[PDB]
Amino acid sequence: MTRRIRIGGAQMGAISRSDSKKEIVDRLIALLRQASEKGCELVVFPELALSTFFPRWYAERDGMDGYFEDGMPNAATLPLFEEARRLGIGFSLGYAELVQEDGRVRRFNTTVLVERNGEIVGKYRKIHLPGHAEYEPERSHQHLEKRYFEVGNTGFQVWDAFGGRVGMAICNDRRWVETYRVMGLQNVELILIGYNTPVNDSEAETLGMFHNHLTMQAGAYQNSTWVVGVAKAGVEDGHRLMGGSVIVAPTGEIVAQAMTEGDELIVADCDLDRCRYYKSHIFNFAAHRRPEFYQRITSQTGVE
Amino acid sequence: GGQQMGRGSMTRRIRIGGAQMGAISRSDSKKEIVDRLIALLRQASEKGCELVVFPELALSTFFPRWYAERDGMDGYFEDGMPNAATLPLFEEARRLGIGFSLGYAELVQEDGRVRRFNTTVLVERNGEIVGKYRKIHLPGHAEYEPERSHQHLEKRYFEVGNTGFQVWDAFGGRVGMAICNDRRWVETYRVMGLQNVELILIGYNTPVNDSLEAETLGMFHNHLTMQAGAYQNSTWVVGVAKAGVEDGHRLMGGSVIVAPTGEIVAQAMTEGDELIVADCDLDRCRYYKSHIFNFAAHRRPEFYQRITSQT
């Protein structure tokens, strides 16, 4: 029990435009309470867990500020922070961050990581923005996240938290090998990823799920780290979001997986010393990195 | 797939034979080895393959398991490429109109000294050598370590390759190579994806520790890394084992051909000489290069500096 933590993945069901924010927060607390009762010490919530997935709707570039969080915590979210601290449970929470930095207003897709004592460990701002900047008439559903958020300015950080090394990424970050590699090069042992993944109706749903798990399982094994992937899933205002929340061991094995598209808690005991094990041995076999052969990864953006 | 998996000949569709090998023991003659590769090449020709992928170090036993002077394994190295013993393979390939990739131990006079590389060569249908890759990631250790159940002395007999991960215009598309445990490194696939690679050829020798298990985990890991590298760089990946029991040391099987979706389209079923074949539409690589993995539109290199400023 030296560096073991019981982790709950708090998958969420659909949030519609018609849901009250008070009732959204109530659902987060209910999941946080179930996690407490199951002995969890850390709870992972989805990306943008405090609203409907509004990137699917067309509006002015600043016409979505009503979904964003004034502060963190603010009046709407303070009940969740207070319940978590009272229960002695840490969490990571995704939200849409509105902030005044260098005079102007900035918009970030953000996850904040809060420790068992209720102190904010840190904050990751989404690097890889999916979707498009403008209405796309040939699409069945819009994805306009690019139109409403700026590229984050935190980098992929890894913090001393929960007895180990903990990092965060957001949604489609999880398809870029660089996302996990950057944090593995900082000795990450637990990566927390909330996501909203639109599903295209009619199959290719199974291939989407395959790719969802494939990228996280490979990130976990190839950087000898735990990976928690938590969905906001289900049908929001006619738009299906993918389920498939998982907790993944540094072996790349899935050790817990959601079975619904609704609010659902998955639990696993995560031994962080298992990450140290695979990273390096006294009699080991893994060659060392040869970055002199990797320069294209930072010297170009697209293909040659 | 529960259907016939082959597809007829077509522009930009390439039929690939994965030529998995069984064990090569220390007591095998060189002719016996070459004749076995020629047999797989003829098998691949009778199935209409235009490209045959051979394993890493396909011309000898996996000699890194044994201890000798640092120049004491040079007798397993190829003098030239081709040489007197390997010329019949090139002659067969040229005559049948089949290209191939071949792993071997390369002994070369260059820069004034003797250099030793773990190497794969890509040979076009016309018989011409079109590219060479020299293994970058050398696994194992440099000196005899008696606490180990088996030795893995690759760092002792090979130098770090000086080619880089190259991608060539070949076989109607963009072809790259890697070797064995290169395939565990996301950088291997990504560096070639940044060169618009459509087909990565990887031969390998993967020792398996004496089990009973976690043998299924080693197989899971083997396929996980190639499937992910394929999908996340929107490229075909061919991984070809030398497998079986060489002089009491077991080598992993599981050769596969993997589509740019990350799906396995062909898989070996034995641990001997075996041919797997799949028809590979290189245009299928635009499936994810158009949007999901459009590198120019999505990558943010200013946040990846640790990957090139690292160990």
Side-chain angles (χ1 to χ4, degrees), chain A residues 68-129:
Chain A
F68 287 66
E69 301 311 312
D70 195 346
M72 181 57 69
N74 56 89
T77 53
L78 193 82
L80 176 69
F81 280 68
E82 284 174 332
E83 253 284 316
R85 171 177 65 259
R86 166 187 319 125
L87 290 184
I89 300 188
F91 60 98
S92 57
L93 175 71
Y95 63 108
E97 184 184 14
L98 193 66
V99 62
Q100 304 270 354
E101 287 190 359
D102 47 282
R104 61 164 162 145
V105 167
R106 308 201 62 177
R107 292 158 177 81
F108 302 116
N109 183 333
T110 306
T111 57
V112 65
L113 169 67
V114 189
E115 173 68 90
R116 279 98 104 219
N117 51 22
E119 216 174 342
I120 289 179
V121 174
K123 199 177 287 201
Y124 165 73
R125 287 167 171 171
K126 195 173 183 178
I127 286 173
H128 303 96
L129 298 187

Side-chain angles (χ1 to χ4, degrees), chain A residues 121-198:
Chain A
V121 174
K123 199 177 287 201
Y124 165 73
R125 287 167 171 171
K126 195 173 183 178
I127 286 173
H128 303 96
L129 298 187
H132 320 287
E134 178 68 282
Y135 198 76
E136 291 287 326
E138 254 70 20
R139 287 186 64 117
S140 40
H141 302 313
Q142 301 307 296
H143 193 132
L144 296 150
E145 195 174 318
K146 261 222 223 176
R147 163 170 277 242
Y148 304 126
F149 297 94
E150 327 183 9
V151 174
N153 59 353
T154 61
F156 293 114
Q157 311 272 286
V158 165
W159 296 268
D160 291 339
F162 297 89
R165 305 281 294 150
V166 179
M168 290 181 293
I170 295 174
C171 200
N172 50 289
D173 282 342
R174 81 201 188 278
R175 76 169 57 120
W176 298 101
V177 299
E178 291 89 344
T179 287
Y180 313 86
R181 183 56 102 219
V182 170
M183 294 187 275
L185 284 161
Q186 309 172 70
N187 196 29
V188 74
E189 306 178 315
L190 166 64
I191 298 176
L192 314 176
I193 315 182
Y195 61 89
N196 293 269
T197 301

Side-chain angles (χ1 to χ4, degrees), chain A residues 127-131 146 151-156 174-178 180-182 185-186 207 210-211 214-215 217-218 221-222 251-253 278 283-298 300-304, chain B residues 136-140 145 147-148 152 160-161 164-165 174 181 183-187 190-191 193-196 217 220-221 224-225 227-228 231-232 261-263 288 292-296 298-301 303-308 310-311:
Chain A
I127 286 173
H128 303 96
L129 298 187
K146 261 222 223 176
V151 174
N153 59 353
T154 61
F156 293 114
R174 81 201 188 278
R175 76 169 57 120
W176 298 101
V177 299
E178 291 89 344
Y180 313 86
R181 183 56 102 219
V182 170
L185 284 161
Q186 309 172 70
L207 203 68
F210 171 68
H211 294 149
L214 175 69
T215 57
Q217 289 179 273
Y221 170 61
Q222 283 174 300
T251 60
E253 299 166 303
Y278 301 109
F283 297 85
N284 59 0
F285 172 99
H288 249 233
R289 280 102 169 182
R290 307 293 312 192
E292 73 269 29
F293 298 105
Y294 309 159
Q295 295 303 116
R296 289 188 193 265
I297 291 178
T298 54
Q300 20 194 121
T301 298
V303 308
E304 57 161 53
Chain B
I136 283 170
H137 299 101
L138 293 187
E145 292 184 4
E147 304 81 349
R148 286 171 191 256
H152 196 112
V160 176
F165 293 112
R174 304 279 299 146
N181 56 290
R183 79 200 189 271
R184 289 211 284 274
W185 296 91
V186 303
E187 294 86 346
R190 182 61 100 234
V191 166
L194 292 173
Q195 300 176 65
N196 203 25
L217 197 65
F220 166 73
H221 286 162
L224 177 71
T225 63
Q227 288 179 277
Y231 170 62
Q232 291 180 273
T261 64
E263 295 164 298
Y288 301 110
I292 291 296
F293 293 123
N294 189 333
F295 288 163
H298 296 290
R299 283 184 79 259
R300 310 299 301 204
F303 290 110
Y304 313 150
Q305 297 298 319
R306 287 185 192 266
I307 304 186
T308 62
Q310 62 139 305
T311 309

Side-chain angles (χ1 to χ4, degrees), chain B residues 68-293:
Chain B
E69 300 290 4
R70 295 180 284 116
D71 48 352
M73 299 297 191
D74 288 7
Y76 293 120
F77 284 65
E78 301 308 318
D79 194 1
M81 181 57 60
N83 63 34
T86 60
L87 181 70
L89 178 57
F90 288 70
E91 281 176 328
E92 282 284 322
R94 166 166 55 258
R95 189 193 89 237
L96 299 176
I98 304 196
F100 63 91
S101 61
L102 174 72
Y104 62 105
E106 173 184 16
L107 194 71
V108 68
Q109 306 275 357
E110 190 78 282
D111 305 304
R113 65 188 173 281
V114 179
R115 312 194 64 180
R116 291 164 188 84
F117 301 111
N118 178 345
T119 301
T120 53
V121 53
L122 179 59
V123 186
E124 180 55 275
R125 290 157 288 197
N126 54 7
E128 179 179 18
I129 294 167
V130 294
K132 194 177 283 192
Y133 167 73
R134 288 168 176 170
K135 195 175 179 176
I136 283 170
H137 299 101
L138 293 187
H141 44 109
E143 265 289 342
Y144 188 71
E145 292 184 4
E147 304 81 349
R148 286 171 191 256
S149 45
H150 67 87
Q151 306 297 314
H152 196 112
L153 296 173
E154 251 189 87
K155 298 171 76 136
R156 188 172 229 264
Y157 310 121
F158 301 108
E159 310 175 25
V160 176
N162 61 0
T163 63
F165 293 112
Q166 305 284 299
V167 176
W168 293 267
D169 293 331
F171 298 92
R174 304 279 299 146
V175 182
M177 291 179 292
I179 297 167
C180 195
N181 56 290
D182 285 340
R183 79 200 189 271
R184 289 211 284 274
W185 296 91
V186 303
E187 294 86 346
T188 295
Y189 309 87
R190 182 61 100 234
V191 166
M192 292 182 279
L194 292 173
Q195 300 176 65
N196 203 25
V197 72
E198 295 165 332
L199 172 59
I200 300 172
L201 309 182
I202 312 181
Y204 63 85
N205 290 270
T206 293
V208 167
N209 233 35
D210 290 332
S211 40
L212 292 146
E213 216 216 291
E215 183 165 327
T216 55
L217 197 65
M219 188 54 74
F220 166 73
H221 286 162
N222 181 42
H223 293 166
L224 177 71
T225 63
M226 291 187 291
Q227 288 179 277
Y231 170 62
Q232 291 180 273
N233 295 274
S234 194
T235 180
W236 293 89
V237 178
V238 179
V240 173
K242 189 168 56 155
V245 175
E246 301 185 338
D247 304 313
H249 294 68
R250 197 157 175 282
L251 292 174
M252 182 188 286
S255 305
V256 288
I257 296 169
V258 183
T261 64
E263 295 164 298
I264 294 173
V265 295
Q267 189 168 343
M269 299 164 287
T270 73
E271 292 175 15
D273 288 358
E274 178 178 355
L275 177 69
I276 65 186
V277 8
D279 288 298
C280 305
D281 182 0
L282 305 169
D283 282 346
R284 188 125 87 107
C285 287
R286 303 128 155 260
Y287 206 152
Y288 301 110
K289 289 180 185 166
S290 324
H291 304 99
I292 291 296
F293 293 123

Side-chain angles (χ1 to χ4, degrees), chain A residues 218-246:
Chain A
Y221 170 61
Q222 283 174 300
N223 300 276
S224 300
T225 183
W226 292 90
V227 172
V228 178
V230 178
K232 175 151 64 52
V235 180
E236 306 186 333
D237 299 322
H239 292 65
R240 182 177 293 277
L241 292 174
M242 179 183 286
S245 290
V246 290

